[PDB]
Design a protein around this nucleic acid. Structure first.
Ligand code: MG
Ligand code: MG
Length: 739
RNA sequence: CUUGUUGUAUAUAUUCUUUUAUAGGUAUUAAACAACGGAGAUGAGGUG
């Protein structure tokens, strides 16, 4: 259906930076008003004032005084239930007849409806509507006890809904069922959910009104929708503009009518819209009405929107592959075995094993691990532990990161000289991804250090001498984000992340094209989500070590907080400085501990930065035009089931219910499953079987209706975790775990 | 108009940057292969 193209202007064009600046100022004032009145103002007062001023009884004005929306907050004009155009007209005429946007014409005297009613106000309404319909609040996990106020209980009651989607009584009951039926885990967490159920269904509607009220309050604090100073775009609706191909050129001409005057904007051609292609015909035959103007690095751009027909193919089920996405060791392990059958595939773990400068520093365990990986089809030999040796000068794993990097870069030069460009781009983007992640870490932790300096220089100290009422205001009135220094770091981070995204797309394109050019009609990923990531446990901070753990006053001989804290004291993580009482009053972060926290952060930050949960979206996008199709498998039990015999190990408690075992009851310390296989090779094989096997393909893979943009050919079922457990049990996917 | 954006050089000069240092900034210098539905500048941790 819809689709965009962007063009650049060549030379003469009346859309200067001042025009976009004026449009941006109008947008920002209007959206600032809407932000400041998202909830305080009532729709009823607006409609009554329109009754006072105009007096008409049109549909939108009548809907303002209807009993459904008479006293609801203004933000309901942006929800799903409220009629769209009625809200548009009501809000528009309210702002207009009060001159709250401050409109005083424009530079080029564009039509008032095309610049104000259908322009920046249209964008403001569209953007606020988009956000409020997908409100995403964020709350912390405060410890829940019997002694707590209703709000303290409720805040965590709303928290669990946010993190796990427990809107319904069914959603809670299917959740308690799951936890109690694996390993018989800690009773304390189950007690929490039981208490919340005693407090969730008690006040369901109140909780539902909350997490909307709170979500909006978390929207008027993050700035709402105020266009960021680096963007500088401008969207307009124009009625009779035409676009024609430039004469004797691979360009286009825009015939924009402005101020009743027929202008002419010269453009450059896009290779997207190159001559003779179907995309050029579709663009020129059916291009929309909305035009966007952007200033991107001191240059102007035009965005149009045309409509096309996608011809996405359908699932074939002849040659399938599962891709496990595990960031530890290789980024992309498949279900395939590296029998040198894939065309245009370079196995980098095999390349690292032929050389001896590498396998002379590797212990007997590491040799077996690397040689097990080298037998399978892997991709992007990211080594999170080795890569951290670049940042850690005193690392035990240094001289391994130097040899690894040198050998990889030497292979890159060899690939350049032998002219294998497909693999050359892959390896160069691998090297640059590894270096750019270190750059991202450097810049993002300079961001955090600078933020801490800013907090302790603006009086945002946790030790505060001001009212908490003022602190929240200033945290919003002058946050770190708006400061000039942060925009420098955020710009550098945007450049680095742009390189990261590009190199990641090059690697993903490489994998997809290898799978497509060999004949793999389906690629089965998993419905991975930010909950499927195992984050390394960061050490307790300075604040938490003394205050929560009550270490602020106790002797070294006195260890009552926890045993794990005592283990942290055993290693040189904290430097506990004794006071005159020989009990720890001042605490430190030791350089060993400082570099431990850095290792934890270095591993954890790979989730969002390297798109842990978006390595399926790019694969789907590559299938919108390719021949390989993408199948999403439920992100559970795939990395917990024996690949040789497809069964979930389960143990019989003496109570008498066959229940699954611990996630570590099946994994040893090494990345080897109890079936004697690499964990990722196990997980990848399981993924494929849930597609290869037709019965399992119908049980968990719910086929969408037809081919659609941005949609996999096969999707996971909507059944919850406990439903998936029982259905496998109902088909005898069961193995007794002989402990 | 060999035409737009992004990715991809471990390139020459560099009394530039440790806030991109196996990389960037400024001068250049060189190349094809790709993708492109506008895009993505929102939080770093502890006992669960
Ligand atoms: Mg770049
Ligand atoms: Mg280029």
């Amino acid at each position: 259906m819809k689709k965009s193209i962007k063009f650049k202007v060549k030379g003469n064009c009346p859309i200067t930076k001042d025009v976009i600046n004026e449009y941006k100022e109008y947008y920002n004032k209007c959206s600032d008003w809407i932000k400041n009145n998202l909830t305080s103002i009532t729709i009823g007062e607006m409609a009554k004032f329109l009754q006072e001023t105009l007096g008409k009884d049109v549909a939108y004005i009548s809907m303002g005084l209807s009993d459904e929306w008479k006293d609801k907050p203004l933000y309901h004009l942006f929800t799903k239930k409220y009629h769209t155009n009625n809200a548009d007209n009501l809000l528009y005429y309210y702002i207009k007849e009060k001159n709250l946007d401050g409109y005083k014409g424009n530079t080029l005297n564009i039509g008032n409806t095309f610049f104000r009613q259908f322009g920046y106000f249209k964008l403001v309404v569209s953007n606020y509507r988009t956000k409020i319909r997908t409100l995403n609040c964020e709350i912390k996990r405060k410890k829940i006890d019997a002694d707590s106020t209703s709000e303290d209980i409720e805040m965590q009651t709303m928290y669990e809904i946010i993190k796990h989607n427990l809107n319904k009584k069914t959603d809670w009951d299917e959740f308690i069922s799951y936890i109690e039926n694996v390993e018989n885990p800690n009773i304390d967490n189950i007690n929490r959910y039981k208490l919340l159920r005693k407090c969730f269904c008690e006040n369901e509607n109140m909780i539902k009104n909350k997490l909307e009220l709170l979500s909006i309050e978390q929207l008027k604090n993050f700035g709402g929708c105020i266009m960021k100073q680096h963007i500088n775009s401008m969207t307009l609706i124009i009625q009779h503009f035409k676009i024609e191909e430039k004469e004797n050129s691979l360009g286009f001409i825009l015939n924009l009518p402005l101020n009743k005057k027929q202008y002419q904007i010269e453009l450059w051609g896009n290779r997207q819209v190159n001559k003779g292609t179907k995309e050029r015909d579709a663009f020129l035959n059916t291009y929309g009405e909305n035009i966007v103007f952007i200033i991107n690095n001191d240059e102007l751009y035009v965005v149009f929107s045309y409509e096309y027909e996608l011809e996405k193919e359908e699932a074939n089920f002849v040659k399938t592959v599962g891709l496990a996405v595990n960031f530890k060791h290789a980024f992309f392990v498949t279900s395939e075995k590296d029998n040198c059958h894939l065309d245009g595939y370079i196995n980098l773990y095999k390349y690292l094993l032929e050389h001896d400068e590498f396998t002379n520093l590797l212990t007997n365990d590491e040799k077996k691990d690397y040689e097990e990986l080298s037998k399978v089809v892997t991709f992007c030999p990211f080594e999170n532990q080795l890569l951290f040796a670049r940042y850690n000068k005193m690392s035990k794993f240094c001289k391994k990161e130097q040899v690894l990097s040198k050998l990889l870069y030497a292979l890159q030069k060899q690939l350049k000289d032998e002219n294998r460009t497909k693999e050359y781009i892959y390896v160069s983007c691998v090297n640059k991804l590894r270096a750019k992640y270190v750059s991202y870490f450097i810049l993002k932790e300079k961001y955090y250090e600078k933020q801490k300096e800013y907090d302790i220089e603006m009086g945002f100290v946790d030790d505060s001498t001001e009212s908490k009422e003022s602190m929240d205001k200033r945290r919003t009135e002058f946050p770190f984000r708006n400061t000039p220094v942060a925009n420098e770091l955020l710009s550098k981070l945007n450049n680095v992340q742009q390189d990261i995204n590009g190199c990641l797309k090059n690697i993903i394109n490489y994998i997809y094209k290898i799978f497509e050019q060999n004949g793999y009609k389906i690629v089965a990923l998993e419905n991975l989500e930010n909950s499927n990531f195992e984050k390394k446990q960061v050490l307790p901070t300075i604040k938490s070590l003394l205050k929560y753990h009550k270490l602020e006053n106790q002797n070294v001989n006195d260890i009552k907080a926890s045993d794990k804290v005592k283990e942290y004291i055993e290693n040189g993580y904290y430097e506990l400085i004794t006071n005159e009482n020989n009990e720890i009053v001042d605490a430190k972060y030791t350089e060993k501990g400082a570099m431990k926290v850095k290792n934890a952060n270095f591993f954890n930050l790979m989730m969002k930065s390297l798109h842990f949960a978006s390595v399926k979206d790019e694969f789907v996008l590559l299938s919108n035009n390719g021949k390989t199709q993408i199948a999403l498998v439920p992100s559970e039990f795939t990395s917990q089931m024996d690949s040789t015999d497809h069964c979930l190990y389960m143990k019989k408690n003496d109570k008498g219910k066959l229940v699954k075992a611990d996630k570590k009851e099946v994994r040893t310390k090494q990345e080897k499953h109890i079936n004697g296989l690499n964990a990722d090779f196990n997980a990848a094989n399981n993924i494929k079987y849930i597609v290869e096997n037709e019965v399992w393909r119908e049980i968990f893979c719910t086929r969408p209706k037809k081919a659609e943009y941005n949609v996999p050919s096969l999707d996971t079922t909507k059944k919850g975790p406990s439903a998936i457990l029982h259905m496998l049990k109902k088909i005898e996917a069961i193995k007794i775990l002989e402990t």
